[PDB]
Amino acid sequence: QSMMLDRIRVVLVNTSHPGNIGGAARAMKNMGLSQLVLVQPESFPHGDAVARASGATDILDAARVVDTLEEALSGCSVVLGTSARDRRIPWPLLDPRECATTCLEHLEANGEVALVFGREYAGLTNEELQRCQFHVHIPSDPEFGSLNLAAAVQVLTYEVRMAWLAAQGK
Amino acid sequence: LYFQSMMLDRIRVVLVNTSHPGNIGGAARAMKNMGLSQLVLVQPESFPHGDAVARASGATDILDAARVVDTLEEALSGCSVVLGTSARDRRIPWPLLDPRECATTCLEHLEANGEVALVFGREYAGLTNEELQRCQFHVHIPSDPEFGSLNLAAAVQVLTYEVRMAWLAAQGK
Ligand SMILES: Nc1ncnc2c1ncn2[C@@H]1O[C@H](C[C@@H](N)CC[C@H](N)C(=O)O)[C@@H](O)[C@H]1O
Ligand SMILES: Nc1ncnc2c1ncn2[C@@H]1O[C@H](C[C@@H](N)CC[C@H](N)C(=O)O)[C@@H](O)[C@H]1O
């Protein structure tokens, strides 16, 4: 199919900087994704989000704003949460590529995937992470492993697109 | 072992005529997150600047060590190989590598103390035909054809991320 990417929900939890929402929206659009969900964002709507969303204001316009992570994950068949610190057994830890493979398996099965991203400052709570079935870590310099929020979104969606293309022989 | 990590230092990130200083800071952070250190800026419109420092949270060291130059030729001096980036994956000039092939070509070239430059363009205009001609390889990140180009910092992040992924795999991870 090609409407597969529309079944990927990008969930941003309690975003502090509105420019990161715009940046995430742009990263999404560049990769073929459209469904953005915001859980209690600090400031939204906001000019800085629009500013950073060059060519992707439509995503921001269609964004769902909710009060809880539970509400954000409603209807999903699989939830993958991002972690920049590291592993919690028994939850499996995957890299961006493995994340992409799982996403497409679920999409091909006609499921709904959710990709969860945390706060710039604190990330995701343990409680939030536990609502996920898989955890995803972007390999990085251990002394400086925290990527900008929108940049993390870009890496994941990129891998997702790469996996989707390959599944098509592209 | 240890000089494995030193390989990444030999990868020069070149930003050509950057308009928004936030993008310079974003690029620097993306580089640092991936283990890269060397930033070269060709005629930035505004630098140094506060937005760059802010965007480069924790990666100010890269900004500090950045070299600012008048020409691309200057920027590439001492490099071994040059890879350029193209937002368009249109057919007419010079066959394109994806980020993965790009990561591999970059690593192969780090052999025998080689120096590699990764070149990025202007937020609106990209790289000129002349600038691209200075590149031996041209890289395109696959993206939705119907829509736009990636933000400049986001593009630096994808390429540097692929470089780290290849570099890690080569070590057994
Ligand atoms: N290396 C990474 N792997 C996976 N996600 C990351 C990574 N770096 C940043 N992110 C994402 O970016 C969001 C915002 C980060 N700045 C938060 C970092 C926070 N200190 C943490 O411990 O995760 C994180 O919650 C993740 O969603
Ligand atoms: N899909 C992509 N593939 C390779 N590089 C990209 C891609 N998207 C953005 N970039 C990089 O980010 C820079 C700035 C872009 N926003 C410029 C887009 C411009 N309209 C063009 O067609 O070049 C480009 O010069 C590239 O360095």
Side-chain angles (χ1 to χ4, degrees), chain A residues 1-87 89-170, chain B:
Chain A
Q1 264 121 285
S2 311
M3 259 135 53
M4 276 188 171
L5 309 175
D6 299 329
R7 283 187 279 114
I8 307 160
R9 204 174 289 194
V10 169
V11 181
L12 313 185
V13 177
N14 187 41
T15 313
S16 177
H17 315 298
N20 286 318
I21 310 183
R26 195 192 176 168
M28 266 162 96
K29 186 119 186 256
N30 291 319
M31 294 301 138
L33 282 79
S34 59
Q35 216 193 148
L36 184 64
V37 176
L38 309 174
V39 185
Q40 290 180 311
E42 288 295 315
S43 319
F44 187 80
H46 182 114
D48 293 342
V50 176
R52 292 261 262 278
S54 335
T57 58
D58 58 313
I59 289 173
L60 298 184
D61 289 339
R64 253 170 106 229
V65 183
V66 300
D67 294 325
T68 63
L69 183 58
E70 166 154 289
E71 229 191 303
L73 317 175
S74 184
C76 290
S77 76
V78 72
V79 188
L80 296 99
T82 53
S83 192
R85 267 174 186 134
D86 305 70
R87 172 135 203 162
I89 277 113
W91 281 259
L93 196 59
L94 320 166
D95 71 32
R97 202 157 305 157
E98 298 170 313
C99 168
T101 299
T102 309
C103 292
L104 270 114
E105 268 161 18
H106 279 262
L107 290 180
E108 269 146 345
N110 215 34
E112 247 265 29
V113 174
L115 301 177
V116 191
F117 304 82
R119 292 157 268 250
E120 291 94 327
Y121 31 119
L124 293 183
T125 64
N126 278 353
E127 311 58 65
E128 276 148 13
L129 277 171
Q130 279 166 54
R131 288 178 161 273
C132 306
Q133 291 81 46
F134 299 86
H135 289 165
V136 184
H137 174 66
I138 295 168
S140 53
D141 194 304
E143 256 165 280
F144 198 87
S146 262
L147 282 80
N148 161 271
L149 176 64
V153 174
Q154 187 69 278
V155 164
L156 265 54
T157 56
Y158 157 71
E159 286 287 23
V160 157
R161 183 168 190 86
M162 286 312 261
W164 172 87
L165 283 176
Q168 250 135 41
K170 276 118 190 175
Chain B
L1 33 126
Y2 157 66
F3 56 82
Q4 276 283 309
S5 70
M6 266 166 68
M7 269 192 263
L8 312 179
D9 292 345
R10 289 195 312 283
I11 299 176
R12 196 179 299 189
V13 172
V14 186
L15 305 189
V16 183
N17 190 223
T18 311
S19 155
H20 319 299
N23 286 325
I24 306 180
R29 191 183 179 175
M31 288 174 58
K32 208 183 166 61
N33 288 319
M34 294 309 137
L36 282 69
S37 67
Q38 209 190 152
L39 178 77
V40 177
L41 312 171
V42 186
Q43 295 179 312
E45 291 297 339
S46 319
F47 178 87
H49 188 281
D51 288 344
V53 177
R55 296 274 269 279
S57 72
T60 53
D61 53 317
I62 289 177
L63 301 185
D64 191 20
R67 287 173 52 230
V68 186
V69 296
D70 311 324
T71 66
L72 180 58
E73 254 197 53
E74 235 250 65
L76 313 174
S77 165
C79 278
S80 158
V81 76
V82 186
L83 298 87
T85 50
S86 153
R88 348 89 177 322
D89 53 312
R90 271 55 205 247
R91 73 288 297 233
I92 247 212
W94 229 309
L96 300 164
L97 306 184
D98 68 16
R100 226 154 269 171
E101 202 168 353
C102 165
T104 294
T105 309
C106 174
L107 285 158
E108 277 173 80
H109 283 263
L110 293 150
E111 268 178 40
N113 209 222
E115 192 90 0
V116 167
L118 292 170
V119 190
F120 304 79
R122 298 159 188 90
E123 293 94 323
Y124 172 58
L127 295 167
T128 73
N129 276 336
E130 291 205 335
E131 282 149 1
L132 289 159
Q133 265 144 52
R134 297 203 164 257
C135 306
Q136 300 92 26
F137 300 96
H138 311 259
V139 181
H140 177 67
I141 299 177
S143 57
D144 192 301
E146 198 195 321
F147 308 127
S149 75
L150 275 68
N151 165 261
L152 171 62
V156 175
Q157 187 71 275
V158 173
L159 271 45
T160 61
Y161 156 75
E162 285 293 5
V163 162
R164 199 187 174 75
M165 293 294 284
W167 173 86
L168 282 172
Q171 286 171 269
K173 207 101 129 92

